[PDB]
Design a protein around this ligand. Structure first.
Ligand SMILES: CN(C)c1ccc(C(=O)NCCCCCCC(=O)NO)cc1
Ligand SMILES: [K+]
Ligand SMILES: [K+]
Ligand SMILES: [Zn+2]
Length: 357
């Protein structure tokens, strides 16, 4: 019935410590609360993932090493994933939160479960990557598999959801769809349209490479085109949706030129399928804009229209100088040639023809 909102004071305090997005969790929760949206959701405390729960995907060797280094502060713990004190605990908290959301969906407690602090899509079974030390999305998908036969993973973060795609590269039980920037030197470097999965999983991986400057209209046209085909061919029983906000105009990633409205249209399209849906966050480095985005998306989920004026709350000053919920696109050029986008969409349409349930 009402959406499940994964939250607890302890969980947010933990997430707030993440070095790349300091206090972002509190900002997001704070704005959602200022709009009184929590009163329309079922608040559920997340559990902490146990070593064995994390091991449903990650290797013991990796988890044991992560735990060891987290104690002092060849597993990818380099420049992007430094071994800081307590990182194992922060990771287990987020993995546990996504698993908890998955469990709520399986129990039929709700049709939609939200963990805005999740979405660490780059982590591999035995390697940390791109600020991600644990892949909570994979953990949630594996939990959902207990109830739902086919799971669709959709990743709208600016970056390719390589960790999730790789985890399920060889299977047809989980289809991964990622829309992302694909350019020379842009992390992680994978996900061209020709990347369709491997072996029994061939054609069960979908990738839409996009160039700088994409805006809401074209982005939704692409997303609707792909998801329509995906739904028809794959007939998913549940969905895990990653909504990293690093695609939003104003993000220091300076790549895409989206607004929450565009991402909201993609979300609505998925919500109309009326399937169990696990909602996750992800990237988003302009903190106030990420809070604006996810708060607006929470409103979309609840079917509510929010006031344009940012309500007074703990982080009010961060929304200056205009203090409004809407985000204005930049004047950066759209580098996406219509013909190339059309080619990409047709290539994908053709690939999905190979998918038959
Ligand atoms: C010259 N020098 C020392 C460097 C140059 C470039 C990078 C980099 O791109 N790093 C990758 C940035 C991480 C992208 C992950 C963001 C995200 O939200 N993923 O989902 C690093 C160092
Ligand atoms: K993506
Ligand atoms: K797959
Ligand atoms: Zn990202």
């Amino acid at each position: 019935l009402v959406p499940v909102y994964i939250y607890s004071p302890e969980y947010v305090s933990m997430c707030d410590s993440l070095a790349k997005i300091p206090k972002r969790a509190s900002m997001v929760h704070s704005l959602i609360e200022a709009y009184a949206l929590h009163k329309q959701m079922r608040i559920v405390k997340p559990k902490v993932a146990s070593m064995e729960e994390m091991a449903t995907f990650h290797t013991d060797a990796y988890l044991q090493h992560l735990q060891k280094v987290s104690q002092e502060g060849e597993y990818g713990l380099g420049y992007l994933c430094p071994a800081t004190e307590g990182i194992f605990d922060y990771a287990a908290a987020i993995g546990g939160a996504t698993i908890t959301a998955a469990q709520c969906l399986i129990d039929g407690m709700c049709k939609v479960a939200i963990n805005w602090s999740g979405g660490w899509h780059h982590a591999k079974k035995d390697e940390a990557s791109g600020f991600c030390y644990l892949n909570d999305a994979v953990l949630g998908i594996l939990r959902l598999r207990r109830k739902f036969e086919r799971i669709l993973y959709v990743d709208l973060d600016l970056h390719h959801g390589d960790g999730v795609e790789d985890a399920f590269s060889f299977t047809s039980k989980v289809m991964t769809v990622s829309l992302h920037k694909f350019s020379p030197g842009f992390f992680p470097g994978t996900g061209d349209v020709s990347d369709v999965g491997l072996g029994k999983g061939r054609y069960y991986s979908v990738n839409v490479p996009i160039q700088d400057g994409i805006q809401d209209e074209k982005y939704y046209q692409i997303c609707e085109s792909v998801l329509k085909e995906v739904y028809q061919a794959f007939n998913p029983k549940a969905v895990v949706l990653q909504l990293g906000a690093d695609t939003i105009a104003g993000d220091p990633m300076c790549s895409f030129n989206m607004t929450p409205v565009g991402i909201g249209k993609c979300l609505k399209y998925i919500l109309q399928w009326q399937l169990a849906t696990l909602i996750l966050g992800g990237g988003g480095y302009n903190l106030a804009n990420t809070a604006r985005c996810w708060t607006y998306l929470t409103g979309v989920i609840l079917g509510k229209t929010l006031s344009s004026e940012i309500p007074d709350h703990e982080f009010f000053t961060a929304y200056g100088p205009d203090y409004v919920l809407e985000i204005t696109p930049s004047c950066r050029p759209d580098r996406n040639e219509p013909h190339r986008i059309q080619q990409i969409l047709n290539y994908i349409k053709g690939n999905l023809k190979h998918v038959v349930i």
